[PDB]
Design a protein around this ligand. Sequence first.
Ligand code: AGS
Ligand code: MG
Lengths: 360, 58
Amino acid sequence: GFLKLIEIENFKSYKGRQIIGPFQRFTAIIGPNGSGKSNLMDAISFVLGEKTSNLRVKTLRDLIHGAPVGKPAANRAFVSMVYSEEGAEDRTFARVIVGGSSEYKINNKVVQLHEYSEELEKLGILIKARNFLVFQGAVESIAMKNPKERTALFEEISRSGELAQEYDKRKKEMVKAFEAARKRAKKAKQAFEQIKKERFDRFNACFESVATNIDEIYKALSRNSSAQAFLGPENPEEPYLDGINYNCVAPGKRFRPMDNLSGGEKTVAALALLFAIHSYKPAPFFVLDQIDAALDNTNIGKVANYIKEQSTCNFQAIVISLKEEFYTKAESLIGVYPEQGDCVISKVLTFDLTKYPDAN
Amino acid sequence: LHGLQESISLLELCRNTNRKQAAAKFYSFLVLKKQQAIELTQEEPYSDIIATPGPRFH
Ligand SMILES: Nc1ncnc2c1ncn2[C@@H]1O[C@H](COP(=O)(O)OP(=O)(O)OP(O)(O)=S)[C@@H](O)[C@H]1O
Ligand SMILES: [Mg+2]
């Protein structure tokens, strides 16, 4: 279903208790730069259980409003989300900072992080994969990635890499490897091939799904049926050694690798690769931090319209945006504004866009 | 702001506009509150947004 609303108290730049939203299918967070737009994405992934290490602070208490000044506003900070689902009633997830401890609740039923997670895990939300978010600059980091970097990118998300060095130690065990030696060399083959498959499968459980969707996604982003994307490995036997080539045909253009496309074309394929990644094990809502910073005048409307369409079909779209061309296709705006204080103080406004007509 | 100079309704400033013009007015409430040129208030989510002149005057 969808993230219905967000409630926060004293989280990062957001002082006091505020309601954020309620959210619709396509909602855009806007505001002046540096006022705490990203911090709102932190609050979401905080309440979905993110490790303190991945929320841009050193210690958990630093998440509490005012810690950057040495003046934390309280001993107690929290974020909660109301998840709405068709046929079910609303459930409430909340995460609370109490001194140095995190405390988690579901409809006030206190739980441990484990039970908190597996309940979010069955809604389609993987705090390990971070399937529900896209960090500022992700697109252009993708767009610059070479085939071996692309393989690496698949390896970490698929958890392929965890077994990658116990693979290296048993391949090292086999290169070095009178009949009592033939039988131990037989244990080498078994011990290696067992790891060759473990890693092979982890990689392919993930990569093969992305590869069949990327083309239909590249078509929809282009808004042109003459577009084609291709994702395949340089080592179909052992994909996690070589690279992942990425071939595209841009509309009214010739077939060629993604790297040789023009900047405007590179980013579109990079979005296609991105959405195809999140096409693997997809989240009910999708959170994009300033995806539109990479975009230029031509294709800004094309992805705004692709997201506008996916919001009523495939997932709730919660998008931080800095370009009026993108965020004016939203159903609603959450405008962030700053008050004056020792540190920055964020507060939100809510604007309905459906009350007004599209532009000429 | 200049024409805007006693309290102001956002939903009235957006009478008869299209999306890009209303989003523009909204976005300008944010920047004016940032620039202290106004204060503002909103009762509940998606209600009218109301601006009274702010500590840095007109
Ligand atoms: N615990 C905290 N208390 C008060 N302020 C904080 C806290 N943690 C972070 N901040 C501040 O939150 C402010 C806004 O941070 P962000 O949300 O990342 O800004 P932003 O709007 O995303 O900026 P961009 O990406 O340049 S447009 C930062 O300047 C921080 O100094
Ligand atoms: Mg940011």
